[PDB]
Amino acid sequence: WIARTFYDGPEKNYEKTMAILQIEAEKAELRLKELEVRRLMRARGDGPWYQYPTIDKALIDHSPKTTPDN
Amino acid sequence: PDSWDKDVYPEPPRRTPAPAPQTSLPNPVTYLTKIFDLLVDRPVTLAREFIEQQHAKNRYYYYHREFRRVPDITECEEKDILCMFEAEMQWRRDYKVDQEIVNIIQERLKACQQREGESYRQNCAKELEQFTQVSKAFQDRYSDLGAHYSARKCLAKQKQRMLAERKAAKEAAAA
Numbered sequence: 001w002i003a004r005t006f007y008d009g010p011e012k013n014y015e016k017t018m019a020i021l022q023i024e025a026e027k028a029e030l031r032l033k034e035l036e037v038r039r040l041m042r043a044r045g046d047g048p049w050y051q052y053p054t055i056d057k058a059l060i061d062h063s064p065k066t067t068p069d070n
Numbered sequence: 071p072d073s074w075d076k077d078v079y080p081e082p083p084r085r086t087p088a089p090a091p092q093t094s095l096p097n098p099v100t101y102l103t104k105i106f107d108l109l110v111d112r113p114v115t116l117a118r119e120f121i122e123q124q125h126a127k128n129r130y131y132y133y134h135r136e137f138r139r140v141p142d143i144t145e146c147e148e149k150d151i152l153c154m155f156e157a158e159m160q161w162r163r164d165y166k167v168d169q170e171i172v173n174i175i176q177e178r179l180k181a182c183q184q185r186e187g188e189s190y191r192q193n194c195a196k197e198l199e200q201f202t203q204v205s206k207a208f209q210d211r212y213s214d215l216g217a218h219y220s221a222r223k224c225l226a227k228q229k230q231r232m233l234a235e236r237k238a239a240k241e242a243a244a245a
């Protein structure tokens with residue numbers, strides 16, 4: 001009676017644990033991957049991250065400048 | 071009684087001597103056990119008959135749960151957590167079953183010692199060898215894993231023992 005009215009079967013807890021373990025394992029591997037990706041982008045600068053501004057080339061004036069040699 | 075298996079818990083045939091009274095003087099044990107039967111065994115049996123028939127009016131059953139076999143820790147990839155969980159649970163169930171096997175053999179040993187009386191040293195050698203074998207196997211499997219034991223630690227211990235055995239056998243063959 002106690003088992004019937006207060007508790008559930010073992011399969012429920014077993015499969016809930018399986019799902020929880022999957023979630024945590026993927027989170028751990030994602031954390032490692034993100035750390036490595038951040039390190040690579042900060043070192044190489046070719047990624048979307050750690051992009052530091054440079055001078056906009058639309059500011060340059062391309063006209064004759066009173067002297068032939070610029 | 072049918073409540074347990076006679077093979078898992080064996081007993082000898084239990085030979086009992088017959089009373090051979092050398093005198094006509096009345097002993098107290100037989101008369102006293104007769105009045106004990108009359109005063110205790112009979113009403114207790116009546117109450118049990120009533121309780122058993124009340125139980126028989128309402129008969130219902132329960133079942134022993136069956137667990138199938140799952141791949142063990144040796145077949146699990148290095149970080150695959152789902153198979154590791156399944157293997158760990160299976161290993162824990164097997165560990166408890168092994169504990170219960172050791173308990174059964176120890177019960178056999180204790181019963182033999184009590185039963186054989188003054189002849190227990192000679193007449194309980196079979197149970198002593200059974201317990202020696204089972205204890206050796208259990209100690210090989212689980213002795214030094216400690217708290218925070220796991221299937222991986224048990225596998226590592228087995229692998230270490232197997233390397234030692236293989237090295238010894240190769241030395242013996244080449245000696």
Ligand SMILES: CCCCCCCCCCCCCCCCC[C@@H](O)O[C@H](CO[C@H](O)CCCCCCCCCCCCCCC)COP(=O)(O)OCC[N+](C)(C)C
Nearest residue numbers: 001002003004005006007008009010011012013014015016
């Ligand atoms: C002879 C009797 C022997 C057994 C004695 C039993 C004693 C029962 C009281 C002790 C209870 C222990 C604590 C249990 C708390 C948790 C229980 C909880 O899990 O059950 C919930 C229900 O909780 C109960 O309603 C709590 C009962 C609280 C009262 C207990 C008895 C004492 C109450 C005293 C009140 C006095 C008030 C003033 C009177 C004048 C519903 O659970 P749920 O998550 O769905 O479960 C899912 C699985 N299902 C679907 C199979 C169930």
